[PDB]
Design an enzyme around this catalytic site. Sequence first.
Site, PDB file in Angstrom:
ATOM      1  N   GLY B  43       0.696  -1.153   0.144  1.00 48.52           N
ATOM      2  CA  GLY B  43       0.471   0.015  -0.001  1.00 48.52           C
ATOM      3  C   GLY B  43       0.890   1.605  -0.142  1.00 48.52           C
ATOM      4  O   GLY B  43       1.744   1.215   0.605  1.00 48.52           O
ATOM      5  N   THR B  44       0.362   2.191  -0.594  1.00 44.83           N
ATOM      6  CA  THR B  44       0.977   3.429  -0.436  1.00 44.83           C
ATOM      7  C   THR B  44       0.617   5.020  -1.493  1.00 44.83           C
ATOM      8  O   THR B  44      -0.334   4.314  -1.357  1.00 44.83           O
ATOM      9  CB  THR B  44       2.510   3.398  -1.637  1.00 44.83           C
ATOM     10  OG1 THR B  44       3.592   4.204  -1.745  1.00 44.83           O
ATOM     11  CG2 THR B  44       2.218   2.863  -3.087  1.00 44.83           C
ATOM     12  N   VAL B  57       9.982  -1.133  -9.008  1.00 47.92           N
ATOM     13  CA  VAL B  57      10.097  -1.115  -7.724  1.00 47.92           C
ATOM     14  C   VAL B  57      11.843  -1.056  -8.020  1.00 47.92           C
ATOM     15  O   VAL B  57      12.577  -1.212  -8.571  1.00 47.92           O
ATOM     16  CB  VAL B  57      10.403  -2.279  -6.936  1.00 47.92           C
ATOM     17  CG1 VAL B  57      11.174  -1.663  -5.588  1.00 47.92           C
ATOM     18  CG2 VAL B  57       8.905  -2.766  -6.592  1.00 47.92           C
ATOM     19  N   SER B  61      16.151   4.884  -0.400  1.00 47.60           N
ATOM     20  CA  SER B  61      16.762   5.007   1.289  1.00 47.60           C
ATOM     21  C   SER B  61      15.539   5.617   1.769  1.00 47.60           C
ATOM     22  O   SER B  61      14.725   6.273   1.701  1.00 47.60           O
ATOM     23  CB  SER B  61      17.380   6.491   1.821  1.00 47.60           C
ATOM     24  OG  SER B  61      18.343   6.622   3.274  1.00 47.60           O
ATOM     25  N   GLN B  62      15.638   4.444   3.294  1.00 48.80           N
ATOM     26  CA  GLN B  62      14.291   4.415   4.276  1.00 48.80           C
ATOM     27  C   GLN B  62      14.760   4.667   5.529  1.00 48.80           C
ATOM     28  O   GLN B  62      15.400   4.707   5.756  1.00 48.80           O
ATOM     29  CB  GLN B  62      13.573   3.152   3.676  1.00 48.80           C
ATOM     30  CG  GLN B  62      14.617   2.055   3.666  1.00 48.80           C
ATOM     31  CD  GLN B  62      13.877   0.887   3.165  1.00 48.80           C
ATOM     32  OE1 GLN B  62      14.608  -0.438   3.179  1.00 48.80           O
ATOM     33  NE2 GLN B  62      12.464   0.394   2.758  1.00 48.80           N
ATOM     34  N   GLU B 155       4.101  -9.820   8.145  1.00 45.24           N
ATOM     35  CA  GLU B 155       5.617  -8.964   7.284  1.00 45.24           C
ATOM     36  C   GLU B 155       6.047  -9.382   6.649  1.00 45.24           C
ATOM     37  O   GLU B 155       6.098 -10.241   6.617  1.00 45.24           O
ATOM     38  CB  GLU B 155       5.266  -7.578   7.754  1.00 45.24           C
ATOM     39  CG  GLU B 155       6.791  -6.828   8.500  1.00 45.24           C
ATOM     40  CD  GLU B 155       7.489  -6.194   9.098  1.00 45.24           C
ATOM     41  OE1 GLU B 155       6.640  -5.074   8.105  1.00 45.24           O
ATOM     42  OE2 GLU B 155       7.972  -6.498   9.255  1.00 45.24           O
TER      43      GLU B 155
HETATM   44  N1  LIG Z   1       3.719  -0.415   3.124  1.00 47.30           N
HETATM   45  C1  LIG Z   1       3.688  -1.753   2.731  1.00 47.30           C
HETATM   46  O1  LIG Z   1       2.714  -2.314   2.111  1.00 47.30           O
HETATM   47  C2  LIG Z   1       3.937  -2.161   4.841  1.00 47.30           C
HETATM   48  C3  LIG Z   1       3.341  -3.757   4.407  1.00 47.30           C
HETATM   49  C4  LIG Z   1       3.952  -3.920   5.776  1.00 47.30           C
HETATM   50  C5  LIG Z   1       4.988  -3.380   6.316  1.00 47.30           C
HETATM   51  N2  LIG Z   1       5.494  -2.086   6.349  1.00 47.30           N
HETATM   52  C6  LIG Z   1       5.381  -1.122   6.809  1.00 47.30           C
HETATM   53  O2  LIG Z   1       5.336  -0.427   7.011  1.00 47.30           O
HETATM   54  C7  LIG Z   1       7.145   0.620   6.330  1.00 47.30           C
HETATM   55  C8  LIG Z   1       7.773   1.449   5.652  1.00 47.30           C
HETATM   56  O3  LIG Z   1       6.833   1.798   4.919  1.00 47.30           O
HETATM   57  P1  LIG Z   1       6.563   1.494   2.901  1.00 47.30           P
HETATM   58  O4  LIG Z   1       7.859   0.918   2.288  1.00 47.30           O
HETATM   59  O5  LIG Z   1       5.294   2.339   2.716  1.00 47.30           O
HETATM   60  O6  LIG Z   1       7.425   3.153   3.410  1.00 47.30           O
HETATM   61  P2  LIG Z   1       9.133   3.242   3.416  1.00 47.30           P
HETATM   62  O7  LIG Z   1       9.486   4.047   3.724  1.00 47.30           O
HETATM   63  O8  LIG Z   1       9.685   2.290   3.125  1.00 47.30           O
HETATM   64  O9  LIG Z   1       9.681   3.620   1.363  1.00 47.30           O
HETATM   65  C9  LIG Z   1       9.579   4.407   1.119  1.00 47.30           C
HETATM   66  C10 LIG Z   1       8.012   5.047   0.191  1.00 47.30           C
HETATM   67  O10 LIG Z   1       8.782   4.925  -1.564  1.00 47.30           O
HETATM   68  C11 LIG Z   1       7.367   4.786  -2.084  1.00 47.30           C
HETATM   69  N3  LIG Z   1       7.672   4.110  -3.693  1.00 47.30           N
HETATM   70  C12 LIG Z   1       8.151   5.007  -4.925  1.00 47.30           C
HETATM   71  N4  LIG Z   1       8.696   4.964  -5.801  1.00 47.30           N
HETATM   72  C13 LIG Z   1       9.063   3.649  -5.359  1.00 47.30           C
HETATM   73  C14 LIG Z   1       9.961   2.640  -5.985  1.00 47.30           C
HETATM   74  N5  LIG Z   1      10.071   2.876  -7.962  1.00 47.30           N
HETATM   75  N6  LIG Z   1      10.328   1.810  -5.193  1.00 47.30           N
HETATM   76  C15 LIG Z   1       9.812   1.423  -4.483  1.00 47.30           C
HETATM   77  N7  LIG Z   1       9.784   2.288  -3.236  1.00 47.30           N
HETATM   78  C16 LIG Z   1       8.893   3.119  -4.441  1.00 47.30           C
HETATM   79  C17 LIG Z   1       7.189   3.354  -1.940  1.00 47.30           C
HETATM   80  O11 LIG Z   1       5.648   3.283  -2.133  1.00 47.30           O
HETATM   81  C18 LIG Z   1       7.359   3.459  -0.128  1.00 47.30           C
HETATM   82  O12 LIG Z   1       6.050   4.280   0.279  1.00 47.30           O
HETATM   83  C19 LIG Z   1       7.740  -1.242   7.097  1.00 47.30           C
HETATM   84  O13 LIG Z   1       8.858  -0.285   8.615  1.00 47.30           O
HETATM   85  C20 LIG Z   1       6.895  -1.327   8.010  1.00 47.30           C
HETATM   86  O14 LIG Z   1       7.255  -1.884   9.120  1.00 47.30           O
HETATM   87  C21 LIG Z   1       4.636  -1.782   5.155  1.00 47.30           C
END
Ligand SMILES: NC(=O)c1ccc[n+]([C@@H]2O[C@H](COP(=O)([O-])OP(=O)(O)OC[C@H]3O[C@@H](n4cnc5c(N)ncnc54)[C@H](O)[C@@H]3O)[C@@H](O)[C@H]2O)c1
Lengths: 823, 207
Positions: B43-44, B57, B61-62, B155
């Site tokens: 989800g995003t 994908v 940096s996260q 997850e």
């Molecule tokens: N997002 C999910 O669906 C999800 C699922 C399980 C757990 N989590 C929890 O959320 C936290 C991280 O959330 P996240 O992963 O959404 O944010 P993140 O900070 O890990 O990554 C940052 C963002 O970059 C975005 N993005 C845009 N273009 C992208 C690309 N080309 N490739 C990869 N990413 C791109 C992603 O959607 C992501 O939301 C984790 O620590 C975890 O515990 C999230």
Amino acid sequence: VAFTVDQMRSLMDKVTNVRNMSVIAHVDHGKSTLTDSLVQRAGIISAGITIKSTAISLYSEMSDEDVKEIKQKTDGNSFLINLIDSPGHVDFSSEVTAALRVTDGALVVVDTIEGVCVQTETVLRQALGERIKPVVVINKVDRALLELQVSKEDLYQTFARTVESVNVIVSTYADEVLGDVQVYPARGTVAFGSGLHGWAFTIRQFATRYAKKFGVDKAKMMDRLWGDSFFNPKTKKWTNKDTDAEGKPLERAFNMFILDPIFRLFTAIMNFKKDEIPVLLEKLEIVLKGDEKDLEGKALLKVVMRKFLPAADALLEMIVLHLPSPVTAQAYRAEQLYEGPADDANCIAIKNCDPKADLMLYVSKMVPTSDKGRFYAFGRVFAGTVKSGQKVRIQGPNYVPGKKDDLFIKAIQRVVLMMGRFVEPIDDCPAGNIIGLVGIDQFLLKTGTLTTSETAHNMKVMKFSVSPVVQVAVEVKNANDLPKLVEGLKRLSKSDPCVLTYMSESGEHIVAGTGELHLEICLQDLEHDHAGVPLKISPPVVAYRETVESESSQTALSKSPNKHNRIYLKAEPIDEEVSLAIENGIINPRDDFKARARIMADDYGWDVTDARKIWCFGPDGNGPNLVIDQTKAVQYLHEIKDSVVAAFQWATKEGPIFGEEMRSVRVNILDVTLHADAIHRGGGQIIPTMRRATYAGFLLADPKIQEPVFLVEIQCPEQAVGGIYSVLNKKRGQVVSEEQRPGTPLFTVKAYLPVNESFGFTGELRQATGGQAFPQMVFDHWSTLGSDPLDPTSKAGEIVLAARKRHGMKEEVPGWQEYYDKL
Amino acid sequence: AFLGDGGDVSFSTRGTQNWTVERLLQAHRQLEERGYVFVGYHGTFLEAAQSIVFGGVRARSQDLDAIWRGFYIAGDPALAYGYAQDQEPDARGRIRNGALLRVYVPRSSLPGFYRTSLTLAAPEAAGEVERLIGHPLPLRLDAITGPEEEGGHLETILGWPLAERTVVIPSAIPTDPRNVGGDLDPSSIPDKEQAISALPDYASQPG
Ligand SMILES: NC(=O)c1ccc[n+]([C@@H]2O[C@H](COP(=O)([O-])OP(=O)(O)OC[C@H]3O[C@@H](n4cnc5c(N)ncnc54)[C@H](O)[C@@H]3O)[C@@H](O)[C@H]2O)c1
């Protein structure tokens, strides 16, 4: 004719030689055509910032003996004429009144064959109600000659019947305090001609011709040139008997000296009798020039006629000689135009058109300008003199001497002359003149009154409202034209202060108006002018309001996405008095929180504790919705305030019921729990929490919807008044009052009409009153429906369901559990 | 192209454009026919969804510890649903709903998928994870599945190298524009999508 600002001022100084008038005519009867003749003849040009043509300045000059015939005080031979623009269709009733209210005279155009139409009759009726003096011109005579090929006597009788019809309307609806104001051809208050070919005449013009060659003062001559006066050609004698001794018919003077010369030209020219034409032209002393001498048919007829009897001259003659000056008219128009004591110092100043007294300037409309998106105030000075820099009292519609409601004491930037599409700055402007003002558009929406006395009431107010009760979604058919629509909406919003363009959450481009017709023309202006691209427009939709009328059954609770933040709140209804106060500026968002709290506590029974803890209004940060902070000992509470307020702005703009704005909704934040670290309580965390808590709290306070309701004012002859009630009875209408204008058979009916019942209302009223009714409706109030919006079969619910489907939402309204914390 | 047949797919507040359950069923089938397997939801926000689906994908940096960096997904859409929205308001404070994405990997990568009972992203689990994947963190061409928090959802973390070999297509599960921050309604999950959302069997022991 080109003039300098100096000459204009000297001209506006002699206000006895000014003529404020408008043109009453059906568009199909060459209204604009005759208007063009006037501007091309006497139009005043001036030796950057452009505006929408609202008024035109005309200059006419006459003789010492011509001025002597004027039965009102005069000063010089120069005359300044203000031609006030008017709507094209009577459907625009509100702006028809605005034009007539700033005028003193009227040029009424009627057709030769079709006579007086229903529209012109209705408008003339209103003009007379404003105590406006009429002069008549019978247009499109050409059709009677070229098409019908009528005889001279037939044409005469046609005019006679026309004049008769007009005077029946005049004598019936003209105010007795004006005296005999009927029009008579023999008196010069009636002209005849054809705007198409650009010719027209009065009996006075022909009287001047024959006055000499009959050794008779033109007074007696023109008295003969109409009615039963006969000049026997065989005896060279004048008679009142239409037969000679031997019983032979005699031709009346009108047919012999006026129509005959014209008929002869029409016959000679249109029958291409090249041998007669020259002799006929020299006879009337009509000289042609080079190119013109080779013309024939209609081409030649048009040239000969319009230099033989220039239309503009006939019209200007009547206007200057018979139409009242500001001085004369205001003497009997003052009382009517003053919503106060008749013996008031200001009302007396208006009767005398006193340039020295306290300023009394009337703003009839706001005019779009090229100076950014600003509007110039168009109106008329009835008393005193307006000056650049002069600080004035801007009194809005709802203003009343005593209160400070709807009042703004500001300064006039620049006073300007409105020369059609252009603007000319000037120092001052005495009473009796039409003028424009700069730097008022932010205090006046449309209509208002400018004064300098702390005891002056408003002038007869024209009811108006900016409330967008109807709207449509606008969309381009070709995706490439998107940018053109974006800027088109941007400039449509600037051509009218009462039009509203915005974007819903779903991204839709919305256009909202004040009425069906108003929104109609805006969408036409948009698709042809402001945008110019093919548009896909949805059917007109009525705007509703979402509200609650009881306190939340239980506390509303909502968590943030990260699960670290919680908001506890409760919704409750706001009194109508308070909502109205907010909508009327009494309770103001920009006001000192302590001064405002004192008002809500003293005048509206609020706890000053609560009133001092208002966080914001909404929507748009000024709506009839409030957030009250009722929390105790919450750490970092202030650090989320901007997020809470933001969430409220979005929550109140589109409610949970079906996406409509909220109204009269008070939200009490009872408790808040936040994460110590600011990283986990930003906007992304708080905003959704507050919005959903608000929704949950709203749905727990037995939700309701409100519908917009018009106040309708209808003028109509007693005979056709019955139709008014016939139409209202099937529109959920509610009669407020029925009043009759004393002496006349004109009735004024006021009633409440739901906006969602007003679609095609004027059409049905037209049908039912034979076009005699003169409708006029402005948004009045919101009305809460008794039915339950959550019930799909009820009246309110039926409305909700239809809207939800239309928006692609889930048919059934969401339960509060949906927005409440899931647990 | 793995989006199936139809119009141009785009992401919007109004929902994913030109993306029906039927089109999803075609895209899913054609994915399996080419040796791809579904491993979960991501989800995003809207622009991120556009980036992921059309650009792929990409490592970035996260905000976490270096050793746990990677692409995060969830077998249960409800978990990923909570992240399908704006994390930052604009100037006007508008918080839009996002979109659920389906994540597919080559079956050739399945041997690198492991599961654990410990809570991930925590120092106490780093040792057990490094044991299962047979090398020190971060994850590379491998993945780990376990509770995001004690007693919570499962997850999945795809090592960046593996994440960049995924194919991501839109889900037929919509987000609610009028309930941003709400929870996923089971009734809004198309039955025909549920039927194609079975997850692979992950290894509990080292390769
Ligand atoms: N997002 C999910 O669906 C999800 C699922 C399980 C757990 N989590 C929890 O959320 C936290 C991280 O959330 P996240 O992963 O959404 O944010 P993140 O900070 O890990 O990554 C940052 C963002 O970059 C975005 N993005 C845009 N273009 C992208 C690309 N080309 N490739 C990869 N990413 C791109 C992603 O959607 C992501 O939301 C984790 O620590 C975890 O515990 C999230």
